[PDB]
Amino acid sequence: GSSGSSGQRISLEIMTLQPRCEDVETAEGVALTVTGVAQVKIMTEKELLAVACEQFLGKNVQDIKNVVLQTLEGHLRSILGTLTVEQIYQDRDQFAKLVREVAAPDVGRMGIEILSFTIKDVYDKVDYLSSLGKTQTSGPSSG
Incomplete structure (x- = not known):
């Protein structure tokens, strides 16, 4: 599946990058699939933005979105590794906050x-959790 969009100029407009990762064993050791969704935009410098301008000048829109997307993406994995499969689902809103809080001072x-960071969908390709199907059960007790 190839892409095609006319445009021979940088797109300052806000860029929508979705930091997703697959096959990322959690803290315990369970590979999970997190889509993730965050928004980003180019920054301006009343002095000189040659740090990002010259870094984007000449390249292709796709390239830019990639570079930026990578920064956030990578982090996600790192934050996903230290976080188990529970802590994640438990408080997803937070998980994302970390990926952005750690990448914010990085980008x-x-x-x-970065503008905002949220989570789209988090499923397990190995269908590990699903198979277990957490459900309320009953059990006997002595006293």
Whole structure:
């Protein structure tokens, strides 16, 4: 599946990058699939934005979105590794907050600022959890 969009100029407009990762064994050791969804945009410098401008000048829109997307993406995995399969689902809103909180002060190196970070869908390709199907059960007790 190839892409095709007319445009021979940088697109300052806000860029929508979805930091998704597959086959990322959680803290315990369970590979999960997180789509993730975050928005980003180019930053301006009243002085000189040659740090991001020259870094995007000449390249192709796709390239840019990739570079930026990578920064966030990578982080996700790192934050997903230290986080188990529970902590994640339990408080997803937080998980994303970390990926953005850790990448926020990072993208500032290239010249990009993050707007927001959220989670789209988190499923397990190995269908491990599903198979287990967590359900309320009953059990006997002595006293």
